[PDB]
Amino acid sequence: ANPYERGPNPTDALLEARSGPFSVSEENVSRLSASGFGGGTIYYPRESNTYGAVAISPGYTGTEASIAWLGERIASHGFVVITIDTITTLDQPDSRAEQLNAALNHMINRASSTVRSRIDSSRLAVMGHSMGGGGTLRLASQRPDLKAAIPLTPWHLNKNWSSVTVPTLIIGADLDTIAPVATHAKPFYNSLPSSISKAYLELDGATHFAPNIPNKIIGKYSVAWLKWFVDNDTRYTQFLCPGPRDEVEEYRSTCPFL
């Protein structure tokens, strides 16, 4: 038995639904309460258990409101998720890495007993949009004990992520003009080691802001990635490997993963 396994046997329909099967509550993190980040919202399963924990960063000028849907949706599949605000709207990717790190430490050590009691502090992941996705790659490089990293339409001036050993799913948007896949997402994917678990999923007919709107493909693949890498949930490998065919423009991976 896998002691980390949560929730029912998955299907495409259950993964593409707006909500998973776990009822969710929220805990506000004020700016005053937050050390090292701008505050945010913690989404957690009402059902008492331990779960993996995830921190998600927005991009430049963005706030937690732009990633709230994704925090709620992932939490509804059996994760504790914080959507952060940054200290300023100007903060760059390497700063968003530090703030993601501070948000994970907050959930583990400084949140209510309600939140702390629901976290397995040994099973952590990070995600983010645009510069938040650049932050995701930077923190993954600094914190190899993270179980997963999911950069969404990521932006970073550093193109070389050969130091990352955290299982990483990069989601690019084909029509992105702010973090074009040719200069950001693909170079990031290509520089990650060939020897790690990784994938690149490019959305078809998608702009840079696809991750800011509820999106069944982002929701399905983010949850499947977190289930396999954070929970060792073998029921989810079927969605990742071989993974989706040519609303997916392309899918590259180091499948098989199991």
How far is 81 from 170, CA to CA, in rounded Å? Answer: 19
What is the rounded distance in angstroms from the CA atom of residue 61 to the CA atom of residue 74?
23
d(CA 99, CA 249): 32
State both tokens at 67.
Answer: 């990633």
| Distance between CA atoms of residues 153 and 202, nearest Å | 9
Q: Give CA–CA dist 184/158, Å, rounded.
A: 9
Nearest to 227 by CA among 62, 46, 7, 68: 7
| Integer CA distances (angstroms), 211 to 58, 62, 66, 70, 253, in order | 10, 12, 8, 8, 21
Q: How far apart are CA 241 and CA 69, in angstroms?
A: 26
CB-count burial class (<10 Å; 0-12, 13-18, 19+) for 13: exposed
Strand partners, 45: 24
Among 88, 87, 119, which residue's Cα sits nearest to residue 104?
119
CB burial string 71-96: b at 16+ within 10 A, e below: bbbbbbbbbbbbbbbbbeeebbbbbb
Query: Exposed, middle or buried, 46 (CB in 10 Å: 0-12/13-18/19+)?
Result: exposed
Q: Tell me if residue 76 falls in helix, strand or coil.
A: coil
Active-site annotation, residues:
130, 176, 208
The H or E element containing residue 43 is strand 40-45
Please, which residues have CB within 8 angstroms of residue 184's CB and are 6 or more apart in sequence?
153, 154, 155, 156, 159, 172, 176
Resolution in Å, one decimal, please.
1.6
Q: Which residues are annotated as a binding site for poly(ethylene terephthalate)?
A: 60, 131, 155
DSSP helix/strand/coil, 210: helix
